[PDB]
Design a protein around this ligand. Structure first.
Ligand SMILES: O=C(O)[C@H](S)c1ccccc1
Ligand SMILES: [Zn+2]
Ligand SMILES: [Zn+2]
Length: 227
């Protein structure tokens, strides 16, 4: 097959799916059981000319298995990069699968310090506050605003489309609050957002951690959730 005007991929179950956001920017969101309920995990996929990329794996290796099988079907390519913001089941849940297909779960040395603490396989663990990533024909750059959703949480930036993917740190507008903050820093969160929205004052789209894509407003709204 070829030459088609279709978008937004979905699995037989529907638990996982994607959506065309930009020329080479997509937003994938999966679902993973938790506390006897369902909890969607927002994400993002890059369509480079040297292998797709994931801004975050699935909840579990068995869950991400169906996630990668999707991107590697319409993008006539394969995933060989996995950016991890923080150490969580919704970040490195598929760390096992990433090391089975030759994929690399990029992440900061800290993001791994918590991974092994949970039982994961620990990501690459070789990053810093900021890292200008470049895959084939794409431009990306990490950033560490501060402590918010996790002790090792960071936001993703794209110096070309102005698309920021804060994640769990940048809550959506529809959201009402932050929620469980057992392993989070509500006192530092306000400081983190103030660093993200400041680092870039020309964002075109913002993708939260649990909800839907929006805009730079998400950052401003997040503060309201703390205050
Ligand atoms: O609440 C969050 O942002 C993280 S990703 C989480 C952890 C456990 C269950 C649901 C969500
Ligand atoms: Zn998380
Ligand atoms: Zn999340």
């Amino acid at each position: 097959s070829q030459k088609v005007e279709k978008t937004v991929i979905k699995n037989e179950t529907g638990t996982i799916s994607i959506s065309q956001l930009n020329k080479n920017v997509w937003v994938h969101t999966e679902l993973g059981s938790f506390n006897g309920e369902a909890v969607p995990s927002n994400g993002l996929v890059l369509n480079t000319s040297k292998g797709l990329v994931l801004v975050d794996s699935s909840w579990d290796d068995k869950l991400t298995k169906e996630l990668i099988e999707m991107v590697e079907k319409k993008f006539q390519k394969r995933v060989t990069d996995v950016i991890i913001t923080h150490a969580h089941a919704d970040r490195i849940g598929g760390i096992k699968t990433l090391k089975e297909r030759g994929i690399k779960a990029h992440s900061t040395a800290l993001t791994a310090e918590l991974a092994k603490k949970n039982g994961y396989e620990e990501p690459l663990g070789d990053l810093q506050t900021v890292t200008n990533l470049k895959f084939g024909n794409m431009k990306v750059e990490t950033f560490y605003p501060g402590k918010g959703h996790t002790e090792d949480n960071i936001v993703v930036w794209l110096p070309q489309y102005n698309i920021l993917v804060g994640g769990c740190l940048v809550k959506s507008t529809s959201a009402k609050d932050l929620g469980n903050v057992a392993d989070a820093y509500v006192n530092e969160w306000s400081t983190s957002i103030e660093n993200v929205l400041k680092r870039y004052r020309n964002i075109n789209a913002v993708v939260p951690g649990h909800g839907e894509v929006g805009d730079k407003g998400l950052l401003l709204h997040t503060l309201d959730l703390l205050k």
